[PDB]
Design an enzyme around this catalytic site. Structure first.
Site, PDB file in Angstrom:
ATOM      1  NE  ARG A 135      41.928  36.887  40.856  1.00  0.00           N
ATOM      2  CZ  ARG A 135      42.793  37.812  40.435  1.00  0.00           C
ATOM      3  NH1 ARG A 135      44.071  37.504  40.238  1.00  0.00           N
ATOM      4  NH2 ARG A 135      42.376  39.051  40.207  1.00  0.00           N
ATOM      5  CG  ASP A 149      34.986  35.273  38.912  1.00  0.00           C
ATOM      6  OD1 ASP A 149      34.141  35.731  39.712  1.00  0.00           O
ATOM      7  OD2 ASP A 149      35.828  34.406  39.231  1.00  0.00           O
TER       8      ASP A 149
HETATM    9  C1  LIG Z   1      29.054  30.405  40.593  1.00  0.00           C
HETATM   10  C2  LIG Z   1      30.253  30.535  40.465  1.00  0.00           C
HETATM   11  C3  LIG Z   1      31.752  30.731  40.297  1.00  0.00           C
HETATM   12  C4  LIG Z   1      32.297  32.004  39.953  1.00  0.00           C
HETATM   13  C5  LIG Z   1      33.674  32.142  39.803  1.00  0.00           C
HETATM   14  C6  LIG Z   1      34.518  31.066  39.985  1.00  0.00           C
HETATM   15  C7  LIG Z   1      33.979  29.800  40.322  1.00  0.00           C
HETATM   16  N1  LIG Z   1      34.881  28.632  40.527  1.00  0.00           N
HETATM   17  C8  LIG Z   1      34.507  27.268  40.056  1.00  0.00           C
HETATM   18  N2  LIG Z   1      33.420  27.083  39.222  1.00  0.00           N
HETATM   19  C9  LIG Z   1      33.065  25.886  38.775  1.00  0.00           C
HETATM   20  N3  LIG Z   1      33.731  24.776  39.112  1.00  0.00           N
HETATM   21  C10 LIG Z   1      34.835  24.832  39.937  1.00  0.00           C
HETATM   22  C11 LIG Z   1      35.530  23.672  40.283  1.00  0.00           C
HETATM   23  C12 LIG Z   1      36.648  23.773  41.134  1.00  0.00           C
HETATM   24  O1  LIG Z   1      37.387  22.625  41.502  1.00  0.00           O
HETATM   25  C13 LIG Z   1      36.868  21.342  41.521  1.00  0.00           C
HETATM   26  C14 LIG Z   1      37.961  20.388  42.018  1.00  0.00           C
HETATM   27  O2  LIG Z   1      39.135  20.585  41.280  1.00  0.00           O
HETATM   28  C15 LIG Z   1      40.340  20.912  41.946  1.00  0.00           C
HETATM   29  C16 LIG Z   1      37.065  25.002  41.618  1.00  0.00           C
HETATM   30  O3  LIG Z   1      38.169  25.046  42.443  1.00  0.00           O
HETATM   31  C17 LIG Z   1      38.626  26.227  43.006  1.00  0.00           C
HETATM   32  C18 LIG Z   1      40.154  26.290  42.930  1.00  0.00           C
HETATM   33  O4  LIG Z   1      40.717  24.993  43.076  1.00  0.00           O
HETATM   34  C19 LIG Z   1      41.665  24.536  42.154  1.00  0.00           C
HETATM   35  C20 LIG Z   1      36.383  26.173  41.284  1.00  0.00           C
HETATM   36  C21 LIG Z   1      35.266  26.104  40.446  1.00  0.00           C
HETATM   37  C22 LIG Z   1      32.590  29.656  40.478  1.00  0.00           C
END
Ligand SMILES: C#Cc1cccc(Nc2ncnc3cc(OCCOC)c(OCCOC)cc23)c1
Length: 278
Positions: A135, A149
């Site tokens: 994750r 993270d």
């Molecule tokens: C500040 C900060 C921070 C801290 C911890 C975790 C994250 N997570 C992410 N950070 C950056 N980009 C993200 C993009 C994401 O998806 C874009 C569309 O694709 C399905 C994404 O999706 C969540 C789970 O879905 C699959 C999470 C992203 C951000």
């Protein structure tokens, strides 16, 4: 560098993910406007004062490696808010669930090398992630994944043993025995987490110790129970995972060695992983 932001300088548009400790947003940053991820932490979810959080923020911002996400900015108010770059393809756990039919050996091993490469970078800089899991790994491209993270487990006061969060889950099924029992985090406890992460990928995102409640993990670990060999895994890949799960921390492989071992395998992927239709 680390940018200090005002609330007026960014907008949260969509909820990407949710957690006990906070929520991740798809948003924009207007330093022209470019798209970012925004992690907001619920008020009073961190035991740290604002000076200490700002310090840990500069460390997270100094992180400079291809396979580890960098902190771009922070908004500090009653709630901590964090901006990083947006990853088009998102979380690696969800990706390997969506794409089971389509993912080949080459890719799976390339991700293992990269997580290691990023984890090794953190080790060289004397930093411990403290929460490595699938994750927590993001996909920039299928060929390029990043650890995310970093520094959050510390902000959420994982290290400080006295603290007991209310409604705060612990990634007990990703934790080394000494992290479970004595809340001791090292580079070698991170290796244990690395092993569970590889297992998550090899099983295409199945849950570790599924059906087993968290309170029982330490005792089944002490009985010497481990995650089972994933169907696609050859025994040589599995022994690497298994070596990560040793009671003695100093006997576990080092990230430095794991890069070499996984790189070797990734040059002959079919030999080490058996996937139908690839
Ligand atoms: C500040 C900060 C921070 C801290 C911890 C975790 C994250 N997570 C992410 N950070 C950056 N980009 C993200 C993009 C994401 O998806 C874009 C569309 O694709 C399905 C994404 O999706 C969540 C789970 O879905 C699959 C999470 C992203 C951000």
């Amino acid at each position: 560098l680390l940018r200090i932001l005002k609330e007026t300088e960014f907008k949260k548009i969509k909820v990407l993910g949710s957690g006990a400790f906070g929520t991740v947003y798809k948003g924009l940053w207007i330093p022209v406007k470019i798209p970012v991820a925004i992690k907001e932490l619920r008020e009073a979810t961190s035991p740290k004062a604002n000076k200490e959080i700002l310090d840990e923020a500069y460390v997270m911002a100094s992180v400079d490696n291809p396979h580890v996400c960098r902190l771009l900015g922070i908004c500090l108010t009653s709630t901590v808010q964090l901006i990083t770059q947006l990853m088009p393809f998102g979380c690696l756990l969800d990706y390997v669930r969506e794409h089971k039919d389509n993912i080949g050996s080459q890719y799976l091993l390339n991700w293992c090398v990269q997580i290691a490469k990023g984890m090794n970078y953190l080790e060289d800089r004397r930093l411990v992630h403290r929460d490595l899991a699938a994750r927590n790994v993001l996909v920039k491209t299928p060929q390029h994944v990043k650890i995310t993270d970093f520094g959050l487990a510390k902000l959420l006061g994982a290290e400080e043993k006295e603290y007991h969060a209310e409604g705060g889950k612990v990634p007990i099924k990703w934790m080394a025995l000494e992290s479970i029992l004595h809340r001791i985090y090292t580079h070698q406890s991170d290796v244990w987490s690395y092993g569970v992460t590889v297992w998550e990928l090899m099983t295409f995102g199945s849950k570790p110790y599924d059906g087993i409640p968290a309170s029982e993990i330490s005792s089944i670990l002490e009985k010497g129970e481990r995650l089972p060999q994933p169907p696609i895994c050859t025994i040589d890949v599995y022994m690497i995972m298994r070596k990560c799960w040793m009671i003695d921390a100093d006997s576990r492989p080092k990230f430095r060695e794991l890069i070499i071992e996984f790189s070797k395998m990734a040059r002959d992927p079919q030999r080490y992983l058996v996937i139908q239709g690839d």
